[PDB]
Amino acid sequence: TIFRLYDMGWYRLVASITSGGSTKTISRDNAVYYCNAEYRTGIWEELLDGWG
Amino acid sequence: MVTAITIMALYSIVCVVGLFGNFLVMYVIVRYTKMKTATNIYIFNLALADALATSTLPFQSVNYLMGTWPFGNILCKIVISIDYYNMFTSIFTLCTMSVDRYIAVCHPVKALDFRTPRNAKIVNVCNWILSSAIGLPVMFMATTKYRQGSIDCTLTFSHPTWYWENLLKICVFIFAFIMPVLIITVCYGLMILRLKSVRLLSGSREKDRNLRRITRMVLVVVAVFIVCWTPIHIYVIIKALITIPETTFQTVSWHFCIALGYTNSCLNPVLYAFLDENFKRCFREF
Ligand SMILES: CNC(=O)[C@H](Cc1ccc(C)c(OC)c1)NC(=O)CSc1ccc2ccccc2c1-c1cncc(OCc2ccccc2)c1
Numbered sequence: 564t565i566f567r568l569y570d571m572g573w574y575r576l577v578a579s580i581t582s583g584g585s586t587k588t589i590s591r592d593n594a595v596y597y598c599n600a601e602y603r604t605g606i607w608e609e610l611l612d613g614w615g
Numbered sequence: 616m617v618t619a620i621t622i623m624a625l626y627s628i629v630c631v632v633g634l635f636g637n638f639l640v641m642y643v644i645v646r647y648t649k650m651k652t653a654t655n656i657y658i659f660n661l662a663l664a665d666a667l668a669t670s671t672l673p674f675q676s677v678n679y680l681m682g683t684w685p686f687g688n689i690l691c692k693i694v695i696s697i698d699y700y701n702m703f704t705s706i707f708t709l710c711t712m713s714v715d716r717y718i719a720v721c722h723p724v725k726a727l728d729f730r731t732p733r734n735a736k737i738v739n740v741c742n743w744i745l746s747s748a749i750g751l752p753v754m755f756m757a758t759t760k761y762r763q764g765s766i767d768c769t770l771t772f773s774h775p776t777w778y779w780e781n782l783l784k785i786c787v788f789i790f791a792f793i794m795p796v797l798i799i800t801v802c803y804g805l806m807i808l809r810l811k812s813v814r815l816l817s818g819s820r821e822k823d824r825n826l827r828r829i830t831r832m833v834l835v836v837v838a839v840f841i842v843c844w845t846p847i848h849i850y851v852i853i854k855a856l857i858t859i860p861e862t863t864f865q866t867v868s869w870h871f872c873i874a875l876g877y878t879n880s881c882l883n884p885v886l887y888a889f890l891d892e893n894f895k896r897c898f899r900e901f
């Protein structure tokens with residue numbers, strides 16, 4: 564249900580390994596820790612952040 | 616009396632709703648400070664041309680029943696001119712709106728430089744002058760005749776009356792699609808290629824949502840205009856060269872297509888009511 568997910572991370576942020584791998588194994592489709600993501604459902608929809 | 620007053624009901628419905636929607640659009644755009652934007656001047660011009668088209672429907676309403684055009688010569692000239700201003704300016708404002716949205720999306724640094732509402736007024740006046748240069752010769756040669764039964768309005772092509780007619784038909788078809796439709800297709804083809812792979816457009820999420828909603832609204836309005844106006848243009852050309860015979864369904868289809876072309880002016884304020892949140896709030900609060 565996701566147009567594309569852009570950034571993913573193990574925020575606590577320890578390190579965010581984004582869609583290219585910068586700011587230092589990819590999917591194409593149209594000590595307690597948590598991993599966040601950012602995505603938009605479609606082209607015209609605003610970016611929104613999801614927590615796991 | 617059934618089908619007759621049915622057709623007059625359609626005239627009254629379409630004219631009243633178009634005039635009310637476009638007057639409300641102009642009222643809310645001018646009376647609010649937050650609506651003065653580079654892409655609300657274009658909408659104001661669009662709902663100016665639509666109201667100009669819709670204001671001639673009561674005269675056709677009177678002309679249908681009596682069978683005679685009883686308003687004289689000047690009003691006939693004005694109505695025939697207003698039709699071509701409607702068609703040309705409604706197709707050029709959408710093209711300039713799409714190129715504006717292209718500049719906004721794919722060229723942010725440049726679009727920050729020159730997108731003030733001072734520029735939009737000059738583009739609107741230049742567009743209206745360019746349209747009027749072609750729409751004034753139509754008023755040059757439109758007159759009320761004296762037919763056998765009832766007087767009617769008509770375009771009197773002066774010297775050969777076979778050459779200028781086809782020249783006007785070919786010119787209107789070639790220009791009022793192949794320039795603006797090709798420009799619009801290229802502009803939105805570039806916009807979608809940018810919008811697919813961009814994380815954020817202006818660096819802020821709110822600016823991202825506000826920049827994508829307006830582009831979606833403009834694309835929906837362009838699609839509505841093209842779908843409403845394509846069949847009459849293609850059907851005029853097919854009647855021009857194919858030489859279709861006289862059939863019981865053919866005349867009704869022709870008058871449907873022309874009715875759709877006039878009916879497109881009604882829809883746009885309704886689309887703006889629930890495609891833009893600020894327009895909906897201003898309509899409700901007003
Ligand atoms: C080369 N000839 C021209 O170009 C003149 C240009 C022209 C001529 C005369 C006038 C008054 C004018 O006003 C804009 C334009 N125009 C035409 O050939 C065709 S337009 C016309 C014109 C006079 C008419 C007189 C009586 C009845 C129908 C007339 C219709 C008409 C025909 N078919 C459909 C229709 O739609 C109504 C409608 C009702 C409800 C919802 C939507 C639309 C209206």
Ligand SMILES: C=CCN1CC[C@]23c4c5ccc(O)c4O[C@H]2C(=O)CC[C@@]3(O)[C@H]1C5
Nearest residue numbers: 698702783784787788847848851873876877
């Ligand atoms: C917006 C609807 C009225 N249109 C103005 C002129 C005309 C027209 C249109 C499109 C292309 C033409 O060459 C043309 O001349 C006319 C014709 O002979 C058919 C119906 C139209 O009244 C109609 C749309």
